Amino acid sequence: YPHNYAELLQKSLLFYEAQRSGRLPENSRLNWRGDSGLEDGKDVGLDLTGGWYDAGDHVKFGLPMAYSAAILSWSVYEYRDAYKESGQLDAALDNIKWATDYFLKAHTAPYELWGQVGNGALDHAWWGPAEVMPMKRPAYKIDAGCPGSDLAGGTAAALASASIIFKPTDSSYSEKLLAHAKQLYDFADRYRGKYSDCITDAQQYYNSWSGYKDELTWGAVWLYLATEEQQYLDKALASVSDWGDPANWPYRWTLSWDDVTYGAQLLLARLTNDSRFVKSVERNLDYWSTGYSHNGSIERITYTPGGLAWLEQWGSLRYASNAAFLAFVYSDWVDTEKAKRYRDFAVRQTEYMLGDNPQQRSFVVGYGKNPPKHPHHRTAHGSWANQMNVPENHRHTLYGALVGGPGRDDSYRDDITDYASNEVAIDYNAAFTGNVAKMFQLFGKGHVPLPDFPEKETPEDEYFAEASINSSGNSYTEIRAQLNNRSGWPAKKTDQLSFRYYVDLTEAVEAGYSAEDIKVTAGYNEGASVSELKPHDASKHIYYTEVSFSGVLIYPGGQSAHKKEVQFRLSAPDGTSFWNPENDHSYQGLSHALLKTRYIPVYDDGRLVFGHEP
């Protein structure tokens, strides 16, 4: 595949735009996303709208969100020129500001931080698009009486890092980010604890496995980079004493949403050249690349036969991308032979996930050769039936998403239910986005992004009636209709849907009758009101009944949620024999099987959204 790293970086940022919760701006690039989570924080009297959905679900998990914004800001701090020359600096700042704007709302008071919106079990029990979520979305906080030094520390890092990269274009937003970063760090430092002991729902999804000692160091050093005030470098270095004996610092994992030791020690290594950090960084990167030499033996992470450094089953590419980012950043600083070995490791790992692998395919949705088609993502899939296999293919392309990837034997299945293969997540793309920036710096000369991308897709039929003839005689027609909301461009809740069924009364007028002699009556009914005949075109004796489901919520969120049924009969007086459905507009093409018809127009709040009037 002819790689284009400006296009790739463009698409990675587009993934974060697909993860946006809240009210979306009118110039949003993704026409299949709409307003969602508009009531986030309403149960606690707060505007907590905005921010990112974590993955293919709709929980706003604060700890990996803070991590993701921090790593995204980190890469703009290291490679601002790459972002600029690829045309992606504006997009990168705009996407990071979505996250940091939300952190500013969540940081309601200096020692109070809202850290989750959405309950994991309630959110994950339902499969559908963000815009029509039907369940309650409770908000959860840490504060001084129930703290979270990891969450507060990591969010402080996100704000402090963002404050640096925003200073050139928006100094007063930078200063606001910085001021909150200092407050959140003091919260994390003064009130010690794991956030998942206080937002207990988080234990089941983003448990604080590593504790908070790494985020305290991470938040402090980012504050030092953002202020150059010695007090924060001292605090960072002092916090490192809680890491224990430097000879026992862990090195077999990597930078992740839970463990930022690897990021903090790297940053401190560049600032101090202290052997504690230099050796710990190189232990980790040796283990990941050519092997860590214990003088005696060589210790190395598992590699797949295809060449992927493979940490564990879930998010294997995320982990290799995370390691490649540390390698890239360290190899831009260190002067030793390590710099070459680590740089080659990072390039090779990045080339693997971009297509150079035994599957011969890109693992980035919408990019490269044979990319993943079924990422585990509710809104991009666009189900109206609360079913992962309906529709059989995704309605929307989730451009830029790095999927979980292969197992330790390079095996991989592009299947919406294969979570280990096809999970997508904001933390998955965070370091990866920076690596793409680096790949553009290294190999992207003359690469330009895609103009006016993506093109808006023509929607499928989103609102429509399926209708059938119950029976029809010489004095009546009885219709069965199911009114559908299968919206996806974007999905939308509708509670003011209606339709009109049109008839021609010429044969009635010729027999000496009029619309006054036709009675329209509802039978089996799921909350609809059925009107008597109203004129559409009096000169041609065209009339319609208005069938209204006013106040009934219909939405693409389940087998029963997406449709409502009404059966209705149009009756001439009993014993008359003039009634003729064959010239009736909305009778055309109907059979006795329920079937979509374009001749029963559908309306939402009075606005025509489907079908044709006579």
Ligand SMILES: OC[C@H]1O[C@@H](O)[C@H](O)[C@@H](O)[C@@H]1O
């Ligand atoms: O299980 C790993 C262990 O390996 C030993 O060689 C180290 O001295 C320990 O610090 C470490 O915990």
Ligand SMILES: [Ca+2]
């Ligand atoms: Ca931690």
Ligand SMILES: [Ca+2]
């Ligand atoms: Ca007729």
Ligand SMILES: [Cl-]
């Ligand atoms: Cl349902």
Ligand code: NA
């Ligand atoms: Na497909």
